[PDB]
Amino acid sequence: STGSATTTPIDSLDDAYITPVQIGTPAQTLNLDFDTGSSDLWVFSSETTASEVDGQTIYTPSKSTTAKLLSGATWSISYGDGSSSSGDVYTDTVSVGGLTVTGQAVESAKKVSSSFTEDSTIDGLLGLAFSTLNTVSPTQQKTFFDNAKASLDSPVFTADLGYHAPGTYNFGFIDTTAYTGSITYTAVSTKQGFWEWTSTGYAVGSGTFKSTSIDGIADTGTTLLYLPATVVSAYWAQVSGAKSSSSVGGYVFPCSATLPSFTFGVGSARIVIPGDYIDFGPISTGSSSCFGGIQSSAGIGINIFGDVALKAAFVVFNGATTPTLGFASK
């Protein structure tokens, strides 16, 4: 089997991408944030505290003839940005882009933190990291990809995120028309539950490539590119007037600036992030200070190849027995 679904930016900055997902029978379509940095499929629901729902579409398990309470199961998750959610668990039929999994754990939120309530465009998350990170207790549950893997033509999914435009998540096949050149594959460590890999270096603009190992995670659920402070300083030093602002929470730059590109290495290959992808616009409406899309990871504990980096590439998440990641230009 295969699936193919379009993913759409939630706003004009590509802060996140939503993908329609069919849950239950008859289908209830919710727009979920596909997150290769986490492993829970959770939704706003008829069980979510009413004051914490503000415009999201909810899953109502009592209206699905295929929903079954997973008795005793609870979940609770906290994300790197400090947001969180928790609840109980149903199993139900879940379909993405024509690919159907029966018996998928659908984690129904009883509580969500304010950042989720305040974003009416995201009805929940669909985790695509390794199932060892799933938070369901006392019986850990498998991700949608893990449940689908055996049925897929090939045990892979691909992320082709757009810049200020829709893109595609494919399951079970690699669309050879969606990228240019060849795909360069690189080793993955699953020891922390992430799609963790080592970039071979970077370049700033037209500068020379610096060969240096940068361990990080491919994370579609993170907006920005978070790299070591040395690398980030070298980038922003090429933008006149750019500075790190403690009050804003990262590097800002004059909105009048033209940003240089940023290149990252994948083996001997190179992925070029155009400068425009690094512009996240005014820090507040009407400001002439703009927020940078490359930020320091120093306070995170891990480097994160988020959407800023991933949308410059066609990215293969190869879930074979020994997982690997593939990157191609597009």
Please tell me whether residue 154 adopts helix, strand or coil conformation.
coil
- Burial (CB < 10 A; 0-12, 13-18, 19+), residue 255, is middle
Residue of 199, 261, 296, 297 marked active site: 199
| 279 tagged catalytic | no
Give φ, ψ of 310 to 5 degrees. Answer: -65, -35
CA distances from 21 to 8, 106, 183, 193 (A): 13, 12, 28, 24
Q: In degrees, to the nearest 5, what angle opens at C-alpha 307 toward C-alphas 224 and 228? A: 40
Only one residue has tokens 């039929």, namely: 93
| CA dihedral (50, 52, 55, 58) positive or negative | negative
What is the radius of gyration, based on Cα positions, of the chain? 20
What's the helix, strand, coil split of the chain in %, to 5?
A: 10, 45, 45
Return the DSSP state at 275: G
The pair of structure tokens assigned to 268 is 């001997």
| CA dihedral (106, 112, 114, 117) positive or negative | positive
Q: Which residues have a Cβ under 8 Å from the Cβ of 148 and sit 6 or more positions away?
A: 1, 3, 99, 101, 171, 172
| 119 tagged catalytic | no
Please tell me whether residue 52 adopts helix, strand or coil conformation.
helix
Q: What is the set of domains in the chain, with CATH numbers? A: 5-174 (2.40.70.10), 175-330 (2.40.70.10)
- For residue 247, count other CB atoms closer than 10 A to its CB: 6
Residue of 14, 35, 40, 92 marked active site: 35
What technique solved it? X-ray
This structure's resolution (Å) is: 1.1
